[PDB]
Amino acid sequence: MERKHHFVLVHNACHGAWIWYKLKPLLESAGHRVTAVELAASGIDPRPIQAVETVDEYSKPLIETLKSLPENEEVILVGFSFGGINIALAADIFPAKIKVLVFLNAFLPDTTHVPSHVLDKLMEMFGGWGDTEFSSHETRNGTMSLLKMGPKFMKARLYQNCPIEDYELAKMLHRQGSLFTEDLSKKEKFSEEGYGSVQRVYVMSSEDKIIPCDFIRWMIDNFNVSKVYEIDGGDHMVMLSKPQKLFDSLSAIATDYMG
Amino acid sequence: MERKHHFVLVHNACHGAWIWYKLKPLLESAGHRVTAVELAASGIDPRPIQAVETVDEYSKPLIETLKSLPENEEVILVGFSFGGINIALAADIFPAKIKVLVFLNAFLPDTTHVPSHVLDKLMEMFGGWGDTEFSSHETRNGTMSLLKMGPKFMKARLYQNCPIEDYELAKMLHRQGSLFTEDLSKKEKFSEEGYGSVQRVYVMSSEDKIIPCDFIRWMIDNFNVSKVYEIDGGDHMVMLSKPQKLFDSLSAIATDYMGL
Numbered sequence: 001m002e003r004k005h006h007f008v009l010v011h012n013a014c015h016g017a018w019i020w021y022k023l024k025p026l027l028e029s030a031g032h033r034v035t036a037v038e039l040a041a042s043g044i045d046p047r048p049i050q051a052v053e054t055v056d057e058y059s060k061p062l063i064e065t066l067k068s069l070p071e072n073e074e075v076i077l078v079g080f081s082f083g084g085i086n087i088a089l090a091a092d093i094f095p096a097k098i099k100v101l102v103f104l105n106a107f108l109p110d111t112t113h114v115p116s117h118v119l120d121k122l123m124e125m126f127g128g129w130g131d132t133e134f135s136s137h138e139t140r141n142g143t144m145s146l147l148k149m150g151p152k153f154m155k156a157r158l159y160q161n162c163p164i165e166d167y168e169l170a171k172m173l174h175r176q177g178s179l180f181t182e183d184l185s186k187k188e189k190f191s192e193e194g195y196g197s198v199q200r201v202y203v204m205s206s207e208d209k210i211i212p213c214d215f216i217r218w219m220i221d222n223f224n225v226s227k228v229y230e231i232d233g234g235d236h237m238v239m240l241s242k243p244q245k246l247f248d249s250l251s252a253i254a255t256d257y258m259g
Numbered sequence: 260m261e262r263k264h265h266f267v268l269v270h271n272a273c274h275g276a277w278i279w280y281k282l283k284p285l286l287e288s289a290g291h292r293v294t295a296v297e298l299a300a301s302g303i304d305p306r307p308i309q310a311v312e313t314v315d316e317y318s319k320p321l322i323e324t325l326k327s328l329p330e331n332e333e334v335i336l337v338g339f340s341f342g343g344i345n346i347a348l349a350a351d352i353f354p355a356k357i358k359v360l361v362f363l364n365a366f367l368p369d370t371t372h373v374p375s376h377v378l379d380k381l382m383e384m385f386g387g388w389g390d391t392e393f394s395s396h397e398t399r400n401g402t403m404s405l406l407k408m409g410p411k412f413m414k415a416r417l418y419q420n421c422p423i424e425d426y427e428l429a430k431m432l433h434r435q436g437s438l439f440t441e442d443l444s445k446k447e448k449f450s451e452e453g454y455g456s457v458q459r460v461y462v463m464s465s466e467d468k469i470i471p472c473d474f475i476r477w478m479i480d481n482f483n484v485s486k487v488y489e490i491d492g493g494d495h496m497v498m499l500s501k502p503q504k505l506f507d508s509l510s511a512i513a514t515d516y517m518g519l
């Protein structure tokens with residue numbers, strides 16, 4: 001039988017490992033191994049976002065996960081939404097541990113501009129945040145901008161193609177988070193030798209109301225990927241609205257990178 | 260269309276409000292109101308159980324929910340597993356805000372023995388902890404016993420009839436918790452005038468492998484209820500394995516306490 005892979009799955013800001021609860025057993029049934037990483041101050045991590053002052057601190061559970069893998073293991077590393085930035089930071093540290101980066105409705109940064117660049121671009125044109133609550137927290141690293149999604153904004157812009165159960169679950173579990181745009185705007189640029197050396201593919205939802213298709217085409221065009229896979233009918237939260245189709249995309253990526 | 264109700268849902272130890280994710284929209288699509296409480300150091304509360312040292316602190320979010328209800332509003336208060344102890348404590352405080360207590364696969368304490376009684380009986384009786392991790396934490400008032408379920412134990416004893424997705428979900432959400440056995444042993448008995456005065460019913464899973472159906476009978480004999488409802492094929496996590504049947508039982512309860 002064909003060889004299986006280890007998928008490492010990285011959630012979006014304000015969410016947690018829990019988002020992967022449908023996708024994980026589909027991947028595992030097909031014989032793959034799955035690690036759903038919980039980022040700092042995410043999901044059931046008992047540590048408020050206010051204690052996680054930088055994007056490196058936020059990402060630390062992923063970096064520790066890659067550090068821990070046995071020698072020469074390579075993973076399919078999937079970053080969702082803000083998880084794109086996480087996986088890019090991880091790839092600049094452990095590029096030989098990554099078979100392919102999977103940017104899933106994700107921020108795809110480049111090696112040319114400041115790491116916040118594609119975030120800053122989206123925020124300029126974002127549209128409505130609805131009932132989302134914005135606040136600040138002062139730190140020895142500067143001021144952190146925090147966000148807590150509002151329920152209307154979740155329903156209209158993230159979860160509009162999800163079953164009602166999933167939306168309810170999300171209301172029970174979403175947390176105050178941050179997109180670390182200040183921290184990102186002054187980090188060093190991602191390197192060509194680390195991040196830039198790693199194979200990458202982009203998986204996009206057709207109905208993502210957060211990360212629209214034109215913005216995606218722009219990021220890709222700014223920083224090329226080897227292949228693009230589309231999920232027809234996916235909302236932003238495509239692991240909840242179309243997990244089977246997400247599984248199909250990841251399965252096509254595992255075949256395409258089985259060498 | 261006759262009166263709908265406000266259901267207040269109280270989760271078990273080591274879990275959180277998220278367990279009710281299937282039940283809540285069922286109740287709500289039938290016109291009822293639902294509050295799924297999140298107890299201290301549970302679910303997404305960024306506070307470790309070690310910091311919550313007493314059952315009264317654990318239960319505070321429930322107390323604050325009840326306290327904030329409008330004057331004369333009464334709720335159907337559902338307590339799942341250790342949630343039974345929480346709802347009894349709440350009923351000892353605010354009996355007049357509770358139309359009926361629903362003990363769902365729940366510890367059902369009495370008004371004769373110390374509040375830990377039924378918990379101590381289960382701990383003496385139960386042989387199936389498997390890979391669960393027991394540990395202690397010392398407080399200034401004494402030892403606090405803690406527990407963190409193991410995934411084999413979850414699969415065999417709580418979730419054995421749940422969809423695989425729900426078990427995966429629980430693995431990414433459950434937390435170290437506590438049954439507060441030392442603290443409950445030191446508390447005053449539940450009262451006949453508060454808790455004892457509130458109507459109570461019992462809803463049981465026919466396949467509960469953690470609170471065995473015989474142990475449930477022993478509890479009910481020990482401290483009777485008005486009515487027992489049975490969910491055929493439920494595991495302990497019956498809001499995940501048989502949510503529609505649970506919905507049916509709580510709708511039947513809602514009918515039997517229709518508001519004259």
Ligand SMILES: O=Cc1ccccc1
Pocket residue numbers: 128129130131152153156157
């Ligand atoms: O896009 C945000 C939003 C908020 C409330 C209602 C509808 C949309």
Ligand SMILES: O=Cc1ccccc1
Pocket residue numbers: 134145
């Ligand atoms: O609309 C307010 C706001 C605050 C911080 C970042 C983006 C928007």
Ligand SMILES: O=Cc1ccccc1
Pocket residue numbers: 053138139140141
């Ligand atoms: O460095 C930031 C900070 C935040 C809260 C308390 C103390 C320091």
Ligand SMILES: O=Cc1ccccc1
Pocket residue numbers: 271272273340341406408469
């Ligand atoms: O819900 C029952 C239970 C029992 C032991 C540990 C956690 C939960």
Ligand SMILES: O=Cc1ccccc1
Pocket residue numbers: 382388393404
């Ligand atoms: O089996 C029950 C038990 C209780 C506390 C510590 C160890 C075991």
Ligand SMILES: O=Cc1ccccc1
Pocket residue numbers: 387388389390411412415416
């Ligand atoms: O209840 C725990 C358990 C542990 C190993 C195998 C089967 C059950």
Ligand SMILES: [Cl-]
Pocket residue numbers: 012013014080081082083
């Ligand atoms: Cl995000």
Ligand SMILES: [Cl-]
Pocket residue numbers: 271272273339340341342
């Ligand atoms: Cl419990």
